[PDB]
Amino acid sequence: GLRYGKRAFVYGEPPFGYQDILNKLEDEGFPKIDYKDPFFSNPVDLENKPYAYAGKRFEISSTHVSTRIPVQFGGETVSVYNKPTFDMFSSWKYALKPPTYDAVQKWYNKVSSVHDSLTHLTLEIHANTRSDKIPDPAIDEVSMIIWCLEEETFPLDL
Amino acid sequence: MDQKASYFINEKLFTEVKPVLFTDLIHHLKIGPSMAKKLMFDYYKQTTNAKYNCVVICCYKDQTIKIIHDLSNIPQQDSIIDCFIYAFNPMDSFIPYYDIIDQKDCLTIKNSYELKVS
Amino acid sequence: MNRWVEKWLRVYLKCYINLILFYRNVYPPQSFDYTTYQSFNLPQFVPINRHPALIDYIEELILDVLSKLTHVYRFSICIINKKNDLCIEKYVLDFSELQIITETEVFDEFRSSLNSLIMHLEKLPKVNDDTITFEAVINAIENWVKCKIKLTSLVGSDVGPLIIHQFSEKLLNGVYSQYSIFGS
Amino acid sequence: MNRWVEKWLRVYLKCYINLILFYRNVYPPQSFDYTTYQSFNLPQFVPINRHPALIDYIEELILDVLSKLTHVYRFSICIINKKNDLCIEKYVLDFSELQHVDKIITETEVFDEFRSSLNSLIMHLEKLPKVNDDTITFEAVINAIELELGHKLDRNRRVDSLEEKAEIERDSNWVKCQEDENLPDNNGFQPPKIKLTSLVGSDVGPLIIHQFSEKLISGDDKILNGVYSQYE
Amino acid sequence: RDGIPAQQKIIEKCIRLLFQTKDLSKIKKYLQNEFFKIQIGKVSAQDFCFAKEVKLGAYKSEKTAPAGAVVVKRRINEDHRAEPQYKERIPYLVVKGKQGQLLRERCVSPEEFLEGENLELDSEYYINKILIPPLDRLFNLIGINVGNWAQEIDDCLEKRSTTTLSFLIKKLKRQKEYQTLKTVCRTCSYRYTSDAGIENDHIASKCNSYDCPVFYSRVKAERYLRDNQSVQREEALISLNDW
Amino acid sequence: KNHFMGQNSIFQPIKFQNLTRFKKICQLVKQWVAETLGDGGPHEKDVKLFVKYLIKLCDSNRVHLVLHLSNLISRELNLCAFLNQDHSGFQTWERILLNDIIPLLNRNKHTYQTVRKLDMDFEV
Amino acid sequence: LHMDALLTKFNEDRSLQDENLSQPRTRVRIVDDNLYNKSNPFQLC
Amino acid sequence: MGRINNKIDDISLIGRLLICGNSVDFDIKSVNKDELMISLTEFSKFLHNILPSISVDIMPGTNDPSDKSLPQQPFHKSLFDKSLESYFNGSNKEILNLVTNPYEFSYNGVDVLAVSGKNINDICKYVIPSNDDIEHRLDLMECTMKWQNIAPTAPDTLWCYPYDPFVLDKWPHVYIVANQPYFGTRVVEIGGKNIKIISVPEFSSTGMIILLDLETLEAETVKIDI
DNA sequence: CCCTCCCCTAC
Numbered sequence A: 001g002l003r004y005g006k007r008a009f010v011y012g013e014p015p016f017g018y019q020d021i022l023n024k025l026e027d028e029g030f031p032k033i034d035y036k037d038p039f040f041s042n043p044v045d046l047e048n049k050p051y052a053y054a055g056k057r058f059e060i061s062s063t064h065v066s067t068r069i070p071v072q073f074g075g076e077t078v079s080v081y082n083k084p085t086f087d088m089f090s091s092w093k094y095a096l097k098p099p100t101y102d103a104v105q106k107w108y109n110k111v112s113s114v115h116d117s118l119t120h121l122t123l124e125i126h127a128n129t130r131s132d133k134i135p136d137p138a139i140d141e142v143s144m145i146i147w148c149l150e151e152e153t154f155p156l157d158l
Numbered sequence B: 001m002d003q004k005a006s007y008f009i010n011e012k013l014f015t016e017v018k019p020v021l022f023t024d025l026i027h028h029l030k031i032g033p034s035m036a037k038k039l040m041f042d043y044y045k046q047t048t049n050a051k052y053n054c055v056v057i058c059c060y061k062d063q064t065i066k067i068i069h070d071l072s073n074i075p076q077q078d079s080i081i082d083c084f085i086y087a088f089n090p091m092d093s094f095i096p097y098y099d100i101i102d103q104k105d106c107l108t109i110k111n112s113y114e115l116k117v118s
Numbered sequence C: 001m002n003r004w005v006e007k008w009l010r011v012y013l014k015c016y017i018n019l020i021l022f023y024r025n026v027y028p029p030q031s032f033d034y035t036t037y038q039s040f041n042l043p044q045f046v047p048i049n050r051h052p053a054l055i056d057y058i059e060e061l062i063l064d065v066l067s068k069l070t071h072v073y074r075f076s077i078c079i080i081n082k083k084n085d086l087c088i089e090k091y092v093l094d095f096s097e098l099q100i101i102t103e104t105e106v107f108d109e110f111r112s113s114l115n116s117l118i119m120h121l122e123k124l125p126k127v128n129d130d131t132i133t134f135e136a137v138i139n140a141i142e143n144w145v146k147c148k149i150k151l152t153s154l155v156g157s158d159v160g161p162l163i164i165h166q167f168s169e170k171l172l173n174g175v176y177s178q179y180s181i182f183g184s
Numbered sequence D: 001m002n003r004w005v006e007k008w009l010r011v012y013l014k015c016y017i018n019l020i021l022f023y024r025n026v027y028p029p030q031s032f033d034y035t036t037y038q039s040f041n042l043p044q045f046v047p048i049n050r051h052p053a054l055i056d057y058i059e060e061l062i063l064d065v066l067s068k069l070t071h072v073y074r075f076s077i078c079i080i081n082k083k084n085d086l087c088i089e090k091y092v093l094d095f096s097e098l099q100h101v102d103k104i105i106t107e108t109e110v111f112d113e114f115r116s117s118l119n120s121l122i123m124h125l126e127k128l129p130k131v132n133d134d135t136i137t138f139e140a141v142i143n144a145i146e147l148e149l150g151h152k153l154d155r156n157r158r159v160d161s162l163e164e165k166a167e168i169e170r171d172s173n174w175v176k177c178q179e180d181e182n183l184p185d186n187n188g189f190q191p192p193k194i195k196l197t198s199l200v201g202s203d204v205g206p207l208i209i210h211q212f213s214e215k216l217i218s219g220d221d222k223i224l225n226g227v228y229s230q231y232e
Numbered sequence E: 001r002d003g004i005p006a007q008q009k010i011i012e013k014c015i016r017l018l019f020q021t022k023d024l025s026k027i028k029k030y031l032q033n034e035f036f037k038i039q040i041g042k043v044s045a046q047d048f049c050f051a052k053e054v055k056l057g058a059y060k061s062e063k064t065a066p067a068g069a070v071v072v073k074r075r076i077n078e079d080h081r082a083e084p085q086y087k088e089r090i091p092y093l094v095v096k097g098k099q100g101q102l103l104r105e106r107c108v109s110p111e112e113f114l115e116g117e118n119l120e121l122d123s124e125y126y127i128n129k130i131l132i133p134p135l136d137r138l139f140n141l142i143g144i145n146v147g148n149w150a151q152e153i154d155d156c157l158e159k160r161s162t163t164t165l166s167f168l169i170k171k172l173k174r175q176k177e178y179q180t181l182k183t184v185c186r187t188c189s190y191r192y193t194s195d196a197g198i199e200n201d202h203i204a205s206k207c208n209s210y211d212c213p214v215f216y217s218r219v220k221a222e223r224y225l226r227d228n229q230s231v232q233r234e235e236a237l238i239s240l241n242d243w
Numbered sequence F: 001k002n003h004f005m006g007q008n009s010i011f012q013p014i015k016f017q018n019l020t021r022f023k024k025i026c027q028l029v030k031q032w033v034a035e036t037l038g039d040g041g042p043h044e045k046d047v048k049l050f051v052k053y054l055i056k057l058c059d060s061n062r063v064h065l066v067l068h069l070s071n072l073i074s075r076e077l078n079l080c081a082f083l084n085q086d087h088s089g090f091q092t093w094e095r096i097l098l099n100d101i102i103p104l105l106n107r108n109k110h111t112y113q114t115v116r117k118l119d120m121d122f123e124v
Numbered sequence G: 001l002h003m004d005a006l007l008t009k010f011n012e013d014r015s016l017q018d019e020n021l022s023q024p025r026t027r028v029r030i031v032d033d034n035l036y037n038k039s040n041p042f043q044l045c
Numbered sequence H: 001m002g003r004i005n006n007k008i009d010d011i012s013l014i015g016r017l018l019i020c021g022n023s024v025d026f027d028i029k030s031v032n033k034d035e036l037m038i039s040l041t042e043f044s045k046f047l048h049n050i051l052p053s054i055s056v057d058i059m060p061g062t063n064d065p066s067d068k069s070l071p072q073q074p075f076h077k078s079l080f081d082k083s084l085e086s087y088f089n090g091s092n093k094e095i096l097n098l099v100t101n102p103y104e105f106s107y108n109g110v111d112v113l114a115v116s117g118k119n120i121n122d123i124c125k126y127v128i129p130s131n132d133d134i135e136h137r138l139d140l141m142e143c144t145m146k147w148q149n150i151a152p153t154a155p156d157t158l159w160c161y162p163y164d165p166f167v168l169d170k171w172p173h174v175y176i177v178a179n180q181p182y183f184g185t186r187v188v189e190i191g192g193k194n195i196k197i198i199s200v201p202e203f204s205s206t207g208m209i210i211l212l213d214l215e216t217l218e219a220e221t222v223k224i225d226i
Numbered sequence I: 001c002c003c004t005c006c007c008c009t010a011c
């Protein structure tokens, strides 16, 4: 265990624990899990218009950093009011993390001798029609008959 | 030739990092391929700083043009009919680049048909 | 000078504590609000606890620490293993500031420090559930009760009188389990 | 004239970054493919990675750098050890003395200069010692003269077009840093000495770019440990 | 089963996207792409067929008869043996027509639609009537309506090489697709013909199965190859390469 | 294309012998060092001007360009060996390129902001 | 057998003859009799 | 051009070069005009550098930008670099000649029937349980000569033919089928007539060239490594 | 705006 220090003070224990936090949050009136409501990936589609239907107001926002509110301390949002004041010869870093080696490697790697049934017989016909008129029993005669008996359920083995 | 081909090779090898082929000497000095091979061999000597990787090919009796890679074991040694430095490479990867050559008077085997314009 | 330093140090410490709490398992995910907040204009998500009592406790701790800043030499958030009472991890904020400097410099310094903290916390291995506890520990120079290593230096504020230094230390029986905290 | 200048700069930056990633084992060599077309005609057969996320990341980074190239006089790619946050290798693209004219150098000459510069880079990179797998990562650092970033979200402006959204993303995607921030703090027990190597640079009519590299090439233990594949 | 397969697929995809990602940007992009594809005509034309069963003798009047009843009656008029069975689904499509024309007035059968030289699917009618109402019913409970998304949606001759390359690429793509379709149809017809040479490609081309998407694809490919635009492209190619 | 620029570009290049491009001045220096070997040695005024230009380049945080020029001169001298070596011009050129150039690399360690950390280990 | 030995065995004693390049030899004349005969069976409009 | 071999006496005997197809390899399903233009400019650079020394005949291939049917029309006058305008003036067709995929070459009185090999590559894509080797391909070419037609598999090889050129009316002296897995030659005698059949391998894999002597009808091979 | 007829589904 790491030593606290030569002269170290200890603060009071937090009110909640790992298991009591969700139960106390439910007791306070909030749901245990705040499932994400429908949102927009980019703020271009927000359209800056109220979302309502049949007198019911719907609050739709986006997860983009542009529409995310600043973190508030004491219930009041803290923000910068004065215009930025820069200095000459400033160096900057790109922040955003690239894909990892493992991710790229993983992507590359993947890419009864008793008759108790009913005998069955089926018939189909072919009739030579005239031009395009569909076969007609009164003018068109039958040229071919095709019959198939079901061998699975046919007894007597003739 | 002397004191000129060496300067051209040095410039094209170090001032700009580009592989130098003997056909480049052929186009530059307007000289025959055998003389270009001779100048490449001459430049291959008297060089204390071996900052380039010479690329050589072996011409066999069966006209098997082969790029020598192993540089230790060359199969069919008695079958080699010609051997010369094909190019000088300042890097491990060869990957040369080719462009349009104005071969006005560098041809050694011209075709029978002459070009007609308008 | 000091006005902007305190004004942004409150928010910086709040984001500090909330990020440490969420990225470890002292309190479970789904108890934080990582979708509707931004810390210091950073592109990353910042989580804030949804329980008003814990938020009020954290804010009171921050205000108490800032009240005695002239006497406090160090401030750290100690990760303590349950059933062992051993400090597995520590995240110290060394203070060498002296009590001029514009608001922009303070904002940029705190934004860079928070970015470094987020990047460091994202790479840390995942810890299991109900096996972690946190404690706020402060050190006096020269609600408070008297009391191997792997150092990892992180960038703090150095834009003038602000000389805050940030670093973390490490080193347990089955607490750590390798496995993406925002994926649930 | 920036319609063609920006395209050539984009091609050069893409080839530069892909070559650095390929030759330093930042990503596995099997993902990289030798190619001539990568949505633009490349100067040579540059190896370009086929990972879609990596391609998008590199393209976005190049576009972000080009969007602020007027204030950027130096763009650098930093090679950082994963075991401990420390810059072990640094490749610098000097954009100072680069003409910024909005008003005929053609493409063949520009690509010839680019071929010479990239050949110099490849020749330098080949001689460097090999790097083990899954132990290194890269970072992007730009040196600007007069700009401030991360302060365009204080106005609570709502974006209405893709261009404005991209601008607000690029203005807040960067964090202020200090010079030689990732370097070791000069412990004093056989202090590391940074090693500087100069490389050739393109000198086309509108494009004047200088390039050089940096390397620790030293240490005081616990640095460059298990990253350079032992002796060879 | 009183709609079309395309609408079923679109609603299923939108609902799955909403339930999994909860992001409306992906739904908007997918819907806009689908609407653009429907407008441009890059659709199967098999997924835009209605099929409702009709009872010919169980209608109050000819005015109250369904849209499929009109198609069935027209087929009966052309041949009396084409009388459908009771409660048999009769497929039909709607086509572009004059303003104010009744829906039952268009009522194109798939056989008539495919053989029709200048018959075009009513993109506006489909996109509005068949797509917007169900999506609005499912999405008005969220607070958004898909109607806005739907409503929101010389020099070349000098460069002979680029123009000829583009024309060649388009023509070769169409030819390769047609060859693949013909190979598929020949392999399918091998079941009956049991032959691999000529007189089997003839039989394969004689197929007119309206339950197979390959038949629709082959008909569309033949129409594209024989279209006037292809003739225009060939004439432009000949003119460009006449130098 | 803005107000902070010192010239048509972001930074003002140092002009030597009415030359601005670095490739042009590099090839001019190479031609001069090739021609001055056969003259018995470069003139003192030319060497002084080159030293002044190198000092200006170093004071402007362009030590990479100074290293590039040093490497170019050293490579030219090495390639000129075995043909014009020890010809009363090679020795003087080598002595100049050592004494008046190599110590100059370890001066003006500034990067427009305080001084660079650690020490310089140039390729030379 | 070292490649230096092969290089000094072949390139050293080069011929350096019949390559004056002032009057290069003409290639053997091979004529296609169907070039202007036309009537190509495989030519389609 | 005689630079490599340096035996100018023997190299000068090669009067003409015949490119038998598959000059560029691409997928029509996913290809833009930029990449195809890059490859075509590379080919045009090769042609410009080699045309002054030798005459080259170009033949369309399967994956070349030409129609998928066997009677492929010649390469368009465009899709070539601007440096070839003099060669494409019309009068100088003895240096550069663009011909159809099946074409009869009367080279100095010797008739040569050449095809880029779609017919043989098309018969070989079937499984015939009544009969891939170099001897098998040569036997298939012999059968194509005996049957007196060039495209036995019409539904797979040729598209709709207006108004059949593939039914032979005259037997050539040399039969060339290119883009094959292996190289092989065989002399056949059908009805007292001697026909020489040559199988030309690809250059991308097994980068081998075939030298055909017109005087003795003997084919000798030249190989290039790397 | 409202009514009637028709199609199809859920319990």
Ligand code: SF4
Binding pocket: E184, E185, E186, E188, E189, E204, E207, E208, E209, E212, E213, E214, E215
């Ligand atoms: S259309 Fe469908 S069914 Fe008719 S042949 Fe082609 S594949 Fe077989």
